[PDB]
Amino acid sequence: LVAGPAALRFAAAASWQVVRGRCVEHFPRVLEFLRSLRAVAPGLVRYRHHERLCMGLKAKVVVELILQGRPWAQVLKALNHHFPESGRDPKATKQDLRKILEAQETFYQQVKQLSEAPVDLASKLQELEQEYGEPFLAAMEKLLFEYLCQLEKALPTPQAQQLQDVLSWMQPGVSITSSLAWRQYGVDMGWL
């Protein structure tokens, strides 16, 4: 169990596979990672970049619960968790904050109106599914890619060997198969 650049790259490689594979059930984990990064290094990316990605991840979590048929009581609990009532960057501007706050409120009201079972609910769910489908997810993945590129710039020279070293400490005496997610992260980040 580790820290430092290796720990950041482990969570980045895992998060990169989660978003590429569209594994919405692990999107909350990507959110904690990005929230940890923002707390220590707010200068990695602009505030608008960070919040666009985080809100996209939150919205998809809520949309997925709706599309999988979860009870509306559970949809609304996750909605209020990820989008609560309340409530920071040298260029954490007002125009970007306006658009960020505005996007939250329209999504909140959209989900609330869906939870009241309007007569055209089925039509609205197919619109919601398109609205937060493939093109939305591709743009989201692009935001994460640029975020992780900024993380790699702030880290020392990568070393591809750490994952196998760390996994052997956690699981001594057994054969650990090389992680494809780890190797794909190194390819996408341009590792030697």
């Binding site: 720990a7 969570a11 596979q17 290094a41 880290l155």
Partner: peptide
């Protein structure tokens, strides 16, 4: 004092690390 030194001194939550390492393998 720099961004690089600030990032490389980061410590993530233990449960986030546990999830990440198991997810990769």
């Amino acid at each position: 004092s720099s961004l690089c030194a600030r990032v490389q001194a980061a410590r993530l939550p233990p449960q986030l690390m546990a999830w990440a390492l198991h997810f990769l393998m």
